[PDB]
Write an enzyme that holds these catalytic residues in place. Structure first.
Site, PDB file in Angstrom:
ATOM      1  N   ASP A 141      93.436  54.664  40.970  1.00 13.18           N
ATOM      2  CA  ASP A 141      93.505  54.148  39.602  1.00 13.18           C
ATOM      3  C   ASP A 141      92.822  52.778  39.478  1.00 13.18           C
ATOM      4  O   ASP A 141      93.500  51.762  39.311  1.00 13.18           O
ATOM      5  CB  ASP A 141      94.993  54.086  39.161  1.00 13.18           C
ATOM      6  CG  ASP A 141      95.233  54.211  37.671  1.00 13.18           C
ATOM      7  OD1 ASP A 141      94.244  54.371  36.917  1.00 13.18           O
ATOM      8  OD2 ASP A 141      96.401  54.131  37.256  1.00 13.18           O
ATOM      9  N   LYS A 143      91.452  50.748  37.311  1.00 13.94           N
ATOM     10  CA  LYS A 143      91.438  50.142  35.978  1.00 13.94           C
ATOM     11  C   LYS A 143      91.463  48.600  36.082  1.00 13.94           C
ATOM     12  O   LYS A 143      92.002  48.079  37.064  1.00 13.94           O
ATOM     13  CB  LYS A 143      92.624  50.656  35.136  1.00 13.94           C
ATOM     14  CG  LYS A 143      94.002  50.592  35.802  1.00 13.94           C
ATOM     15  CD  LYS A 143      95.062  51.126  34.825  1.00 13.94           C
ATOM     16  CE  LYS A 143      96.413  51.309  35.453  1.00 13.94           C
ATOM     17  NZ  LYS A 143      97.296  52.152  34.608  1.00 13.94           N
ATOM     18  N   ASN A 146      94.688  46.581  37.216  1.00 12.09           N
ATOM     19  CA  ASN A 146      94.986  46.643  38.642  1.00 12.09           C
ATOM     20  C   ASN A 146      94.199  45.619  39.480  1.00 12.09           C
ATOM     21  O   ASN A 146      94.388  45.567  40.695  1.00 12.09           O
ATOM     22  CB  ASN A 146      94.818  48.078  39.167  1.00 12.09           C
ATOM     23  CG  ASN A 146      96.001  48.963  38.849  1.00 12.09           C
ATOM     24  OD1 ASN A 146      97.073  48.498  38.472  1.00 12.09           O
ATOM     25  ND2 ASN A 146      95.850  50.259  39.004  1.00 12.09           N
ATOM     26  N   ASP A 159      98.195  46.869  44.821  1.00 12.11           N
ATOM     27  CA  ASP A 159      98.605  48.033  45.593  1.00 12.11           C
ATOM     28  C   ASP A 159      98.848  49.295  44.755  1.00 12.11           C
ATOM     29  O   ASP A 159      98.854  50.392  45.323  1.00 12.11           O
ATOM     30  CB  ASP A 159      99.868  47.712  46.413  1.00 12.11           C
ATOM     31  CG  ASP A 159     101.035  47.247  45.571  1.00 12.11           C
ATOM     32  OD1 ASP A 159     100.877  46.245  44.853  1.00 12.11           O
ATOM     33  OD2 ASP A 159     102.122  47.859  45.671  1.00 12.11           O
ATOM     34  N   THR A 179      94.444  57.161  35.475  1.00 15.37           N
ATOM     35  CA  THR A 179      93.928  56.998  34.127  1.00 15.37           C
ATOM     36  C   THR A 179      92.687  57.873  34.008  1.00 15.37           C
ATOM     37  O   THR A 179      91.726  57.678  34.741  1.00 15.37           O
ATOM     38  CB  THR A 179      93.689  55.515  33.815  1.00 15.37           C
ATOM     39  OG1 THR A 179      94.894  54.794  34.088  1.00 15.37           O
ATOM     40  CG2 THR A 179      93.279  55.290  32.386  1.00 15.37           C
TER      41      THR A 179
HETATM   42  C1  LIG Z   1     102.548  48.018  32.849  1.00  9.96           C
HETATM   43  N1  LIG Z   1     102.273  46.772  33.582  1.00  9.96           N
HETATM   44  C2  LIG Z   1     103.518  46.084  33.913  1.00  9.96           C
HETATM   45  C3  LIG Z   1     103.238  44.770  34.620  1.00  9.96           C
HETATM   46  N2  LIG Z   1     102.425  44.976  35.825  1.00  9.96           N
HETATM   47  C4  LIG Z   1     102.271  43.835  36.664  1.00  9.96           C
HETATM   48  C5  LIG Z   1     101.325  43.823  37.694  1.00  9.96           C
HETATM   49  C6  LIG Z   1     101.141  42.689  38.471  1.00  9.96           C
HETATM   50  C7  LIG Z   1     101.916  41.544  38.280  1.00  9.96           C
HETATM   51  C8  LIG Z   1     101.781  40.360  39.181  1.00  9.96           C
HETATM   52  C9  LIG Z   1     101.626  39.111  38.572  1.00  9.96           C
HETATM   53  C10 LIG Z   1     101.340  38.016  39.366  1.00  9.96           C
HETATM   54  N3  LIG Z   1     101.204  38.073  40.693  1.00  9.96           N
HETATM   55  C11 LIG Z   1     101.385  39.261  41.278  1.00  9.96           C
HETATM   56  C12 LIG Z   1     101.691  40.434  40.592  1.00  9.96           C
HETATM   57  C13 LIG Z   1     101.915  41.690  41.365  1.00  9.96           C
HETATM   58  C14 LIG Z   1     100.946  42.157  42.260  1.00  9.96           C
HETATM   59  C15 LIG Z   1     101.093  43.377  42.872  1.00  9.96           C
HETATM   60  F1  LIG Z   1     100.141  43.796  43.742  1.00  9.96           F
HETATM   61  C16 LIG Z   1     102.194  44.173  42.627  1.00  9.96           C
HETATM   62  O1  LIG Z   1     102.452  45.403  43.112  1.00  9.96           O
HETATM   63  C17 LIG Z   1     103.156  43.689  41.766  1.00  9.96           C
HETATM   64  F2  LIG Z   1     104.217  44.480  41.492  1.00  9.96           F
HETATM   65  C18 LIG Z   1     103.054  42.469  41.149  1.00  9.96           C
HETATM   66  C19 LIG Z   1     102.843  41.552  37.240  1.00  9.96           C
HETATM   67  C20 LIG Z   1     103.026  42.673  36.448  1.00  9.96           C
HETATM   68  C21 LIG Z   1     101.208  45.754  35.553  1.00  9.96           C
HETATM   69  C22 LIG Z   1     101.526  47.046  34.808  1.00  9.96           C
END
Ligand SMILES: CN1CCN(c2ccc(-c3ccncc3-c3cc(F)c(O)c(F)c3)cc2)CC1
Length: 301
Positions: A141, A143, A146, A159, A179
């Site tokens: 994915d 996008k 990510n 990840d 997606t």
């Molecule tokens: C629908 N959205 C909900 C929020 N989401 C989201 C994605 C990233 C983050 C996030 C924000 C800041 N630092 C790390 C992360 C993070 C990085 C990763 F590799 C993760 O595995 C993880 F869990 C958190 C904060 C929220 C992205 C998808």
């Protein structure tokens, strides 16, 4: 056998202070945390929490896979896993905290990026993808949500899309994830997600960042899929010949003929004319300055 136990100082969720909720979704909840104890006390992290009751068999299998992949990966442009632990009712992943936001939030504000920025973001990404391929891993994915940015503005691939190519090949008949807009023709037709499918998604992301729109998209899921398969794309003419050439080489429907599927592998992408100003060794060593960088009234003589 020797009935003797090894002493260890194990981690648990009470060693991490909750600062704020960064996000939420189907996967669970993400918090900004501050480590309380140990050599890394005061350090900030992103903590992803998954409730074992709000978790399907497929969800449990997926989380174990992401953890195992992250433990195996060490790259400057991929998110690092610092801890993994569990309670009776919850699963915890302690990852890097990235303060620079994501590529999608940035794309939505700017509408579109310069070739200079796209060239920088894609070059770091190409390195991240090739490292994953060297370990038999694919990104299901790819996008812009990510791809996060750090304080400096260097990319960090999350990840969320990490999958093993061997596992994905055995489940391809009963598994349809990701997606739709980013899926390669062979992924849409359930023929399997190969390394070649990652280089098609890489071109979709390139097209979206440069033009502000997705190359193959219809009025619904069904139409988008048929559009990906027919693949009759008009190339915007504000794009440089180099950008247009790279896009056509990546948007080849036969995975075997797509740029990166050849003998040189990633060298086919690296040596493309679009990336001629990139020093790939300096880029890997994070020696290249990001073109963009993320984030009092009183006066007297
Ligand atoms: C629908 N959205 C909900 C929020 N989401 C989201 C994605 C990233 C983050 C996030 C924000 C800041 N630092 C790390 C992360 C993070 C990085 C990763 F590799 C993760 O595995 C993880 F869990 C958190 C904060 C929220 C992205 C998808």
């Amino acid at each position: 056998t020797h009935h003797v136990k090894e002493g260890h100082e194990k981690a648990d969720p009470s060693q991490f202070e909750l600062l704020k909720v960064l996000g939420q979704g189907s996967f669970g909840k993400v918090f900004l945390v501050k480590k309380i104890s140990g050599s890394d006390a005061r350090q900030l992290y992103a903590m992803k929490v998954l409730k074992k009751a709000t978790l399907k068999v497929r969800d449990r299998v997926r989380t174990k896979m992401e953890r195992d992949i992250l433990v195996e990966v060490n790259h400057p442009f991929i998110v690092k896993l610092h801890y993994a632990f569990q309670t009776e009712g919850k699963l915890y992943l302690i990852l890097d905290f990235l303060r620079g936001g994501d590529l999608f939030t940035r794309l939505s504000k700017e509408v579109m990026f310069t070739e200079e920025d796209v060239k920088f973001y894609l070059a770091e990404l190409a390195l991240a993808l090739d490292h994953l391929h060297s370990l038999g891993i694919i990104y299901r994915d790819l996008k812009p949500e990510n791809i996060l940015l750090d304080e400096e503005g260097h990319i960090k691939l999350t990840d969320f899309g990490l999958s093993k190519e061997s596992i994905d090949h055995e489940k391809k008949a009963y598994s349809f994830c990701g997606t739709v807009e980013y899926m390669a023709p062979e992924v849409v037709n359930r023929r399997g997600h190969t390394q070649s499918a990652d280089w098609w998604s890489f071109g979709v992301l390139m097209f979206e960042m440069l033009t502000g729109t997705l190359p193959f998209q219809g009025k619904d899921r069904k139409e988008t899929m048929t559009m990906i398969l027919k693949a009759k794309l008009g190339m915007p003419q504000f794009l440089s010949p180099e950008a247009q050439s790279l896009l056509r080489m990546l948007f080849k429907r036969n995975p075997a003929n797509r740029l990166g599927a050849g003998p040189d592998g990633v060298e086919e992408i690296k040596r493309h004319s679009f990336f001629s100003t990139i020093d790939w060794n300096k880029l890997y060593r994070r020696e290249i300055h990001p073109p963009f960088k993320p984030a009092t009234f009183y006066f007297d003589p």
